[PDB]
Design a protein around this ligand. Structure first.
Ligand SMILES: Nc1nc2c(ncn2[C@@H]2O[C@H](COP(=O)(O)OP(=O)(O)O)[C@@H](O)[C@H]2O)c(=O)[nH]1
Length: 311
């Protein structure tokens, strides 16, 4: 089965990796990449790469993206060794600092160069962090676009839309973490199970390879209108820079029990295509899990946003 790897670059990326490992992920290899030796020492990842030792003396990049870049370039061989054999690589980082901003694009370009389907999931800084951080991050996002197959951007300001006055910062961070984690899990599940209408890693490549922005979502629902409700949840995007609107390619997998109806499968597909408001090329799949009773799961991967709009 296709070899999946998730690579956290810099502080935010490392944090995401640690929290994903805590949450529980089967058949995924994690790699932690940082300049900061103290943070690496605390990483839960099975594979750790300290980059730029000579430049930083084991410290972080001090918000300087040129140091993050030079560090990654300096450690290219070690990064190549850690990635070798991967079929798909997810690179996650916080844009705005030095290590994520400068090194994540280098890491992604190595992963792609060496044949892996490469997806980035990065954050933009909070407005309260100031304009310099925002400007550095914007350059990082542009660099990431050039280095990956597909990119998902999570503006940290969106977290302010899902918290009340007391929600812990760490709880908010976990909500952002769900984007990459559930995207990885949906691909892992799609590879592992044969479906009645079967989609596999080649379908994922068709949808995600050499594209631009992406949306990856999952919805789960039971009862009346379950399919419509699951599809709406899969495309809901309160934390995303890139919503479903304008998608021209969608991989949609529906998992249900024996009761999964043709009518509700069409309903789900129609929700996604109507929200995209485009001529969508839909690669549709269906998995019947007989242990499931009234539950339905809809997973969506959407791309093609940069393609010329249709008439
Ligand atoms: N959502 C989220 N954002 C983070 C986290 N840690 C850092 N950030 C964001 O990431 C940006 C870069 O921080 P950091 O990754 O620690 O810097 P670096 O190590 O030099 O790359 C910060 O400016 C924040 O906006 C996290 O755990 N979650």
């Amino acid at each position: 089965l296709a070899t999946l790897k998730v690579i956290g670059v810099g502080g935010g990326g490392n944090n995401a990796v640690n929290r994903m490992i805590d949450h529980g992920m089967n058949n995924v290899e994690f790699i932690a990449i940082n300049t900061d030796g103290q943070a690496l020492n605390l990483s839960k990842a099975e594979s750790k790469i300290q980059i730029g030792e000579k430049l930083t003396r084991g410290l972080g990049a001090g918000a300087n993206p040129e140091i993050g870049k030079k560090a990654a370039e300096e450690s290219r061989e070690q990064i190549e060794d850690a990635i070798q054999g991967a079929d798909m690589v997810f690179v996650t980082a916080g844009m705005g600092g030095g290590t994520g901003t400068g090194a994540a694009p280098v890491v992604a370009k190595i992963a792609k160069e060496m044949g892996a389907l490469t997806v980035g999931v990065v954050t933009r800084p909070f407005g309260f962090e100031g304009r310099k951080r925002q400007t550095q991050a914007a350059a990082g996002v542009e660099s990431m676009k050039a280095a990956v197959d597909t990119l998902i951007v999570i503006p940290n300001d969106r977290l302010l839309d899902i918290v009340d006055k007391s929600t812990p910062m760490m709880e908010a961070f976990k909500e952002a973490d769900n984007v990459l984690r559930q995207g990885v899990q949906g691909i892992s599940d799609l590879i592992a199970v044969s479906g009645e209408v079967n989609l596999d890693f080649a379908d994922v490549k068709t949808i995600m390879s050499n594209q631009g922005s992406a949306l990856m979502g999952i919805g789960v629902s039971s009862g009346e209108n379950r399919a419509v409700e699951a599809a709406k949840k899969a495309i809901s995007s309160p934390l995303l820079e890139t919503s479903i609107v304008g998608a021209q390619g969608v991989l949609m997998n529906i998992t249900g029990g024996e009761s999964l109806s043709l009518f509700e499968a069409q309903e789900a597909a129609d929700i996604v295509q109507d929200a995209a408001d485009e001529d969508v090329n839909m690669i549709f799949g269906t998995v019947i899990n007989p242990e499931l009773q009234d539950e339905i799961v809809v997973t969506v991967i959407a791309t093609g946003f940069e393609d010329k709009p249709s008439s």
